[PDB]
Design a protein around this motif. Sequence first.
Motif, PDB file in Angstrom:
ATOM      1  N   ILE A   1     -65.608 -19.830   7.532  1.00 14.79           N
ATOM      2  CA  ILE A   1     -66.609 -18.783   7.258  1.00 14.79           C
ATOM      3  C   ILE A   1     -67.886 -19.022   8.064  1.00 14.79           C
ATOM      4  O   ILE A   1     -68.785 -18.177   7.985  1.00 14.79           O
ATOM      5  N   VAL A   2     -67.912 -20.069   8.887  1.00 16.04           N
ATOM      6  CA  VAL A   2     -69.068 -20.387   9.770  1.00 16.04           C
ATOM      7  C   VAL A   2     -68.584 -20.424  11.224  1.00 16.04           C
ATOM      8  O   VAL A   2     -67.394 -20.722  11.517  1.00 16.04           O
ATOM      9  N   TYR A   3     -69.481 -20.091  12.128  1.00 16.61           N
ATOM     10  CA  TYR A   3     -69.236 -20.346  13.555  1.00 16.61           C
ATOM     11  C   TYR A   3     -69.038 -21.839  13.762  1.00 16.61           C
ATOM     12  O   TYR A   3     -69.803 -22.601  13.182  1.00 16.61           O
TER      13      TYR A   3
ATOM     14  N   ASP B   1     -69.541 -24.465  16.161  1.00 14.55           N
ATOM     15  CA  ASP B   1     -70.328 -24.614  17.398  1.00 14.55           C
ATOM     16  C   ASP B   1     -69.892 -25.891  18.113  1.00 14.55           C
ATOM     17  O   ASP B   1     -70.407 -26.982  17.790  1.00 14.55           O
TER      18      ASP B   1
ATOM     19  N   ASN C   1     -72.155 -28.638  14.381  1.00 20.53           N
ATOM     20  CA  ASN C   1     -71.253 -28.577  13.207  1.00 20.53           C
ATOM     21  C   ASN C   1     -69.786 -28.779  13.598  1.00 20.53           C
ATOM     22  O   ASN C   1     -69.026 -29.251  12.744  1.00 20.53           O
TER      23      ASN C   1
ATOM     24  N   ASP D   1     -64.955 -19.146  17.201  1.00 19.00           N
ATOM     25  CA  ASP D   1     -65.579 -17.978  16.581  1.00 19.00           C
ATOM     26  C   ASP D   1     -64.894 -17.707  15.231  1.00 19.00           C
ATOM     27  O   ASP D   1     -63.626 -17.727  15.111  1.00 19.00           O
ATOM     28  N   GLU D   2     -65.718 -17.406  14.249  1.00 12.52           N
ATOM     29  CA  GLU D   2     -65.287 -17.106  12.871  1.00 12.52           C
ATOM     30  C   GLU D   2     -64.977 -15.639  12.665  1.00 12.52           C
ATOM     31  O   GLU D   2     -64.483 -15.281  11.548  1.00 12.52           O
ATOM     32  N   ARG D   3     -65.184 -14.793  13.665  1.00 13.31           N
ATOM     33  CA  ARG D   3     -65.056 -13.325  13.456  1.00 13.31           C
ATOM     34  C   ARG D   3     -63.612 -12.784  13.643  1.00 13.31           C
ATOM     35  O   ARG D   3     -63.456 -11.546  13.545  1.00 13.31           O
TER      36      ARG D   3
ATOM     37  N   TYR E   1     -66.650 -24.756   6.010  1.00 15.85           N
ATOM     38  CA  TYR E   1     -68.030 -24.261   6.207  1.00 15.85           C
ATOM     39  C   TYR E   1     -68.921 -25.440   6.593  1.00 15.85           C
ATOM     40  O   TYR E   1     -69.957 -25.666   5.976  1.00 15.85           O
ATOM     41  N   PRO E   2     -68.610 -26.206   7.663  1.00 12.98           N
ATOM     42  CA  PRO E   2     -69.421 -27.365   8.049  1.00 12.98           C
ATOM     43  C   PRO E   2     -70.832 -26.922   8.469  1.00 12.98           C
ATOM     44  O   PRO E   2     -71.029 -25.973   9.216  1.00 12.98           O
ATOM     45  N   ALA E   3     -71.804 -27.660   7.955  1.00 12.87           N
ATOM     46  CA  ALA E   3     -73.239 -27.505   8.223  1.00 12.87           C
ATOM     47  C   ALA E   3     -73.706 -28.570   9.203  1.00 12.87           C
ATOM     48  O   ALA E   3     -73.115 -29.618   9.318  1.00 12.87           O
ATOM     49  N   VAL E   4     -74.836 -28.279   9.822  1.00 13.92           N
ATOM     50  CA  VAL E   4     -75.710 -29.280  10.475  1.00 13.92           C
ATOM     51  C   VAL E   4     -76.634 -29.807   9.354  1.00 13.92           C
ATOM     52  O   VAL E   4     -77.410 -29.039   8.777  1.00 13.92           O
TER      53      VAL E   4
ATOM     54  N   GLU F   1     -71.264  -9.877   8.255  1.00 17.19           N
ATOM     55  CA  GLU F   1     -71.623 -10.524   9.513  1.00 17.19           C
ATOM     56  C   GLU F   1     -73.068 -11.014   9.386  1.00 17.19           C
ATOM     57  O   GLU F   1     -73.496 -11.676  10.327  1.00 17.19           O
TER      58      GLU F   1
ATOM     59  N   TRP G   1     -73.195 -16.399   6.372  1.00 18.65           N
ATOM     60  CA  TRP G   1     -71.918 -17.170   6.248  1.00 18.65           C
ATOM     61  C   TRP G   1     -71.437 -17.142   4.787  1.00 18.65           C
ATOM     62  O   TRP G   1     -70.231 -17.106   4.528  1.00 18.65           O
TER      63      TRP G   1
ATOM     64  N   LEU H   1     -80.829 -24.943   2.996  1.00 19.33           N
ATOM     65  CA  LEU H   1     -79.732 -24.495   3.851  1.00 19.33           C
ATOM     66  C   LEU H   1     -79.787 -22.979   4.021  1.00 19.33           C
ATOM     67  O   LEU H   1     -79.835 -22.242   3.023  1.00 19.33           O
TER      68      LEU H   1
ATOM     69  N   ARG I   1     -75.066 -18.109  11.281  1.00 15.89           N
ATOM     70  CA  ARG I   1     -73.637 -18.338  11.498  1.00 15.89           C
ATOM     71  C   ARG I   1     -73.328 -19.811  11.438  1.00 15.89           C
ATOM     72  O   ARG I   1     -72.202 -20.142  11.130  1.00 15.89           O
ATOM     73  N   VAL I   2     -74.286 -20.657  11.781  1.00 12.88           N
ATOM     74  CA  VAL I   2     -74.147 -22.132  11.656  1.00 12.88           C
ATOM     75  C   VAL I   2     -75.119 -22.560  10.569  1.00 12.88           C
ATOM     76  O   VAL I   2     -76.344 -22.452  10.739  1.00 12.88           O
ATOM     77  N   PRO I   3     -74.643 -23.026   9.404  1.00 11.73           N
ATOM     78  CA  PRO I   3     -75.574 -23.489   8.375  1.00 11.73           C
ATOM     79  C   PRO I   3     -76.390 -24.679   8.859  1.00 11.73           C
ATOM     80  O   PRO I   3     -75.850 -25.600   9.398  1.00 11.73           O
ATOM     81  N   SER I   4     -77.696 -24.582   8.629  1.00 15.66           N
ATOM     82  CA  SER I   4     -78.655 -25.633   8.981  1.00 15.66           C
ATOM     83  C   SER I   4     -79.836 -25.568   8.018  1.00 15.66           C
ATOM     84  O   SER I   4     -80.050 -24.540   7.363  1.00 15.66           O
TER      85      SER I   4
END
Lengths: 524, 524
Positions: A318-320, A322, A334, A374-376, A514-517, B353, B356, B450, B455-458
């Motif tokens: 559900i996340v890009y 990167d 991420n 890409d998550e789309r 859904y990995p975060a930074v 869109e 996330w 968060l 699109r990228v959780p941070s």
Amino acid sequence: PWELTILHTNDVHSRLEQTSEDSSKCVDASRCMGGVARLFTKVQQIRRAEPNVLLLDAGDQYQGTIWFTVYKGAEVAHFMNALRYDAMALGNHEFDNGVEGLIEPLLKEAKFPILSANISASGPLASQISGLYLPYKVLPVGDEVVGIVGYTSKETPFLSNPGTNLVFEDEITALQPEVDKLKTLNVNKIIALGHSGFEMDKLIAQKVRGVDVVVGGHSNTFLYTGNPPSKEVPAGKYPFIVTSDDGRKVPVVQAYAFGKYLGYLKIEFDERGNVISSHGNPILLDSSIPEDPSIKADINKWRIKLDDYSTQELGKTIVYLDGSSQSCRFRECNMGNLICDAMINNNLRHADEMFWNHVSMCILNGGGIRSPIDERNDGTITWENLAAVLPFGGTFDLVQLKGSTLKKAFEHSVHRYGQSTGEFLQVGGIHVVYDLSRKPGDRVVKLDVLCTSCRVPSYDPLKMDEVYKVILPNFLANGGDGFQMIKDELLRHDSGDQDINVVSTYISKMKVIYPAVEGRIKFS
Amino acid sequence: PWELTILHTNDVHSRLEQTSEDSSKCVDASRCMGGVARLFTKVQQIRRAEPNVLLLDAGDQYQGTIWFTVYKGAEVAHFMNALRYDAMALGNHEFDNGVEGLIEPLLKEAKFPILSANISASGPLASQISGLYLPYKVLPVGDEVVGIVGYTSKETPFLSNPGTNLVFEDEITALQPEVDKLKTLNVNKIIALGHSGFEMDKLIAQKVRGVDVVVGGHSNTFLYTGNPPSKEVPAGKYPFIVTSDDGRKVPVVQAYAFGKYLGYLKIEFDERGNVISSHGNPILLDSSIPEDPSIKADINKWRIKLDDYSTQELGKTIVYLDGSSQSCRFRECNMGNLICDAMINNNLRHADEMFWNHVSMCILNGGGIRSPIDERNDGTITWENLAAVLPFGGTFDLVQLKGSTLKKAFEHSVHRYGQSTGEFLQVGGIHVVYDLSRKPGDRVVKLDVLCTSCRVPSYDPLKMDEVYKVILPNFLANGGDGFQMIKDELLRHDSGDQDINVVSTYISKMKVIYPAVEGRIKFS
Ligand SMILES: Nc1ccn([C@@H]2O[C@H](COP(=O)(O)O)[C@@H](O)[C@H]2O)c(=O)n1
Ligand SMILES: Nc1ccn([C@@H]2O[C@H](COP(=O)(O)O)[C@@H](O)[C@H]2O)c(=O)n1
Ligand SMILES: [Ca+2]
Ligand SMILES: [Ca+2]
Ligand SMILES: [Cl-]
Ligand SMILES: [Cl-]
Ligand SMILES: [Zn+2]
Ligand SMILES: [Zn+2]
Ligand SMILES: [Zn+2]
Ligand SMILES: [Zn+2]
């Protein structure tokens, strides 16, 4: 004098198809190497010429490509049966899918004996597995017999998933009585075939009285007598001669990994089974040897299910994800965090009351991450998508590093920061803080690591004298990207699972990611 | 004049068994309340006395106890059928197990109509579900007919798992033409039964011409005329009178939640279906009303599978789950991190869109964590073990809070730090740093959150004016532990899933857990 030709492979690691020179995907067919179809050609040629031939495998056919992911060992039984192997020893990777994933696809379908003298079972498993692997097998060869006695790394519980029933005994302790017994049964020619690494192979040649030859594996050791035929640098002569405690010269052989070479050792035996002479060399399986047309056609038929599998949904994001160089060579990304989390998940093994898990830490060079995802696409992730991210055909290995070594690695990670170079480290189980205003080699200002010897995982400062287990790509374990300190200072190295497969398994288990930074890497 | 008695329940939330006064587990049977066996007694008594009775449910029977976890709605169809409900509207929690988990256990087994006029389906689902719920049903009552027109919260996609086929239309837009149509079919008495909350119920009474009575739910609204009989403080009179746009007085009713009360409204209608009078009050289902012996015996038979389920392995931990007060009221604790991670996993809904996920943040008072879980039982975790950790019978709710409100909450978390008080906050999707050397109310020195609209959780700094979605226990949403700022300043509150069930589902999905203490909460 009775002459035996020993043909041997080890650590083939799912290289059913021909490969590039570096054992990755074959691109320029005219220059490709190995694969079972080419092996078949060469073995057939030798068996036309030499009356007394054994074809032996020293373990670790399991794990390494999409072949293993899809066929789970059925491909190993099928193609080893087609090559008419005489015997195989169990390697550590034969336990990657547990005991159940060894019994069903391999032990029940192999037409040759599968050996290990130092693995014992208890409770109902003992009854279930009795006789499906053997300590040894006496094989007729021409008018003689040869005993083959197997062994498997005592370390297998840390390097695979054998479960808590099986016990891996010290190799020499287990081997000696079986070799002694064969002598009582009028078997005077004895090969030790097994999967513990070159150093243990030398100890077995030295200390196990009655072993004539050791055929080994695990350490991907390349031995050669003369000018090497390819890129691999020999670790010693082929064969490697050990002087036994009883005064005999005992040849020790290995044949690198990935099916690139066929080991070839000629032994002359006297009437009493003493080795009079030994000589040979591994044979580079290059393009000058044609792929057997029948085996090749069978390989191409089996490939269809692999091609179909490659575009199936493994799971969703559900996340890009990167995996861009502009992120992963400059800061926490991420995709890096995902891959390191997958690496640690893959290395969950049985724990002692002394640790929650034997390893908690991961490093990954950002240059090894080759694409975003890409998550789309309805969140879909496929094996093909992961093969774009991790295209080099590597593994995620286990090493032991002093904290001082790891601090030097993190200084190297940012020594020339800002040029989009590949050495910048993504991490798991490590929190690092850099100050780029400091001199190269003095930029790390905080480095905390996740405990293992603790019931509640928590971070503490890295200790310079303490030895840490770390999961990292084989590219880095071998000193890639200028990480010479890792290659030169590590205390232990064991090859792990295929990079793509580690990530695919984790995504499949998680279903939705859904990995975060999250601040694993900061700049002050 | 034609008199109707409307009996009504809403937001029963899996309280099949009698409960304590606070709707948690019944301990002192002599003082317990609610449950379906007691409801049955009271409904039977009323139906002996009153000729014209409807028994209606305004939704949210699903979700709330181990009943729902195990029986997944079969218990709702079975016991609602035993009570001979006349109709039910779909609530948001009827979508907790997707459309498939609504169709199979409830729509196919209910012996009464299930209503919602503002939910539409497309593609193959439209054919699959056609007629299984209805916009309305015309019911015979004595010699008359009454139309009942359903509705369900437009917000259901954020509050449950309805999937991406179903569309939740604005309630008034959808209702008006159906009410208009019933008028054309000589139906002159119309009840709107639905599940959008008291505020929307009042708008429907006002604006939907032809609605005579609104029977609602979702907001757990307690209405009463007179001195309240228990702990619940009324939000207004019962019924609540709205003046419609056409000048009629339209009664609006609700009956709290958890089966504690039976709504009871008496309506007098003239020959043309105009309401002449309305009066009543919810009936407290206390111990002075006996549990029906037959229904009670059936409940006790169904309880056996719940008792068996309660000691089954849900999954494993390889780490000690530290839910000790000495940890969780003083610092980041790994049980806190686990529960918050479960809370966020439970609130993964369909994303735009534009985000996330709609929510990324969790707070949990450490005083709500009531036990650790030892990992040395072969790593096993059972529902019984989780019920020790979370014993209060709560939910994990969704609220909207300004950043200023959340900063005040984190100051309150440490205002009297060091006394082992329950207000210390465990977190997810939030990184906080305290300096306890500062004055109470000025101890928060960093607060990062968060992102959702990314699109990228941070993590980024909290913004005082920005509104954040937060998952938190209902204890805190209601201002428990002195969190009066949360109750007084929140912008939106919706009740969520049972606390134990959120954690159990997450553990089951993860199979093996290893939560770390990772620096979500630090002290400077
Ligand atoms: N087998 C390999 C080869 C290169 N690499 C990475 O690829 C980088 C080079 O990529 P570019 O040519 O894209 O800069 C190396 O610096 C290293 O980080 C790797 O991770 N594994
Ligand atoms: N329904 C409730 C009741 C109390 N609690 C918690 O229990 C604490 C009181 O526990 P002790 O009596 O163990 O100190 C409260 O301060 C609050 O944090 C809760 O989380 N939910
Ligand atoms: Ca001999
Ligand atoms: Ca009317
Ligand atoms: Cl070795
Ligand atoms: Cl409301
Ligand atoms: Zn190997
Ligand atoms: Zn090996
Ligand atoms: Zn509800
Ligand atoms: Zn609701």
